[PDB]
Paper text:
COPI mediates retrograde trafficking from the Golgi to the endoplasmic reticulum (ER) and within the Golgi stack, sorting transmembrane proteins bearing C-terminal KKxx or KxKxx motifs. The heptameric COPI complex (α/β/β'/γ/δ/ε/ζ) is recruited en bloc onto Golgi membranes (Hara-Kuge et al., 1994) but can be divided conceptually into two subcomplexes. The α/β'/ε B-subcomplex has been likened to clathrin because α-COP, β'-COP, and clathrin contain N-terminal WD-repeat (also referred to as β-propeller) domains and C-terminal α-solenoid domains and because recent studies have suggested that β'-COP, like clathrin, can form trimers. We demonstrate that N-terminal WD-repeat domains of α- and β'-COP directly bind dilysine motifs and establish the molecular bases for the interactions using X-ray crystallography, structure-directed mutagenesis, and isothermal titration calorimetry (ITC).
The first structure obtained was that of yeast β'1-304His6 in the presence of the CTFKKTN motif derived from yeast Wbp1 (Supplemental Experimental Procedures). This structure, solved at 1.8 Å resolution by SIRAS, showed that the WD-repeat domains pack one on top of the other in the lattice. The C-terminal His6 tag from one molecule reaches to the top surface of its neighbor, specifically occupying a charged surface patch. This structure suggested a potential binding site for short basic linear motifs, particularly highlighting the importance of a terminal carboxylate group and backbone carbonyl binding. The CTFKKTN peptide included in crystal trials was not visible in the density but was required for crystallization, likely forming weak interactions that facilitated crystal packing. Based on indirect evidence from structures, we predicted a D98A D117A mutant would abolish interaction with the -5 lysine. This prediction was based on the position of a histidine residue equivalent to the -5 lysine in the β'1-304His6 structure and of the symmetry copy K261 in the β'1-304 structure, both of which occupy the D98/D117 patch. In addition to the carboxylate group binding to the basic patch formed of R15/K17/R59, two carbonyl groups from the -2 and -3 positions in the motif backbone must fit into a groove formed by R59 and R101; the carbonyl group at the -4 position also likely contacts R101, as observed in the β'1-304His6 structure.
Residue numbers in the entry: 1 to 310
The structure:
Amino acid sequence: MKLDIKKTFSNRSDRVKGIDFHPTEPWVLTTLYSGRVELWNYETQVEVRSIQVTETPVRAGKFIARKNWIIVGSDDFRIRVFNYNTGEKVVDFEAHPDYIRSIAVHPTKPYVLSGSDDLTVKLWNWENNWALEQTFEGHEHFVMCVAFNPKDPSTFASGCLDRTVKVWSLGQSTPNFTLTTGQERGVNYVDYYPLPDKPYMITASDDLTIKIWDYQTKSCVATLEGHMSNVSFAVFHPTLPIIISGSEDGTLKIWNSSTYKVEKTLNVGLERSWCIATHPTGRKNYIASGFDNGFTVLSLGNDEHHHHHH
């Protein structure tokens, strides 16, 4: 590959806590500490739609493109769903009795997971009236991040300030396993490597480290050091051999996913970094990050997302 980073679109706003790419429209969703959410076309740089959802922080937001929805979770305990074409608020319910940190959407089935400061993950089913179909209990501190395994989304991972990642199966009440990270300040984020050649997950911590894990053996594969403040997230790029992380040190870091050495450090000048998204199909190798003072959409270069794409 050849890293060739271009700034596609950056704009200033209140602190961006959640961020996501639409899979077929050139849109990015940002969810703000102010309770506002913005939908931007980053190619034309024109706001498609925006909503003052609540007065509390909105920490989580995802597209559900197959329903033309966004789904968001906020510190006022509520999950809300809006149709992004009409602005219709579809549903609005109390989901947890404490802050909602993270929302994940199943790739094919009508399932949403929410992770919360109430120590739980909850599974909601939108084809069943958004009923609470399962609550996953076992964590001992705030659940900061939930992520389905894209290679087997009957399973998902929860990253928790109790220093563990728990991996669960839908329909079963205890973890398939609990991975102890040695990241003593807790886990802020968890992501799966999406390709079938490595059974890998990655965790980010306030302890300044990022760790790569074999989820079949539970062994630490590598520890990535160099962020100088809390690491907010770390993710595998879906098609490029890299890892991308962001930190309260104000930087994004791009790491070689084979050597585990840092390749690039970028401070985009928006202060602390909080959240990350990568384009679902690697379109123009777009990534986006949200920060204290706004967001940025970057293109990482021209390497193809599909073998023999040209």
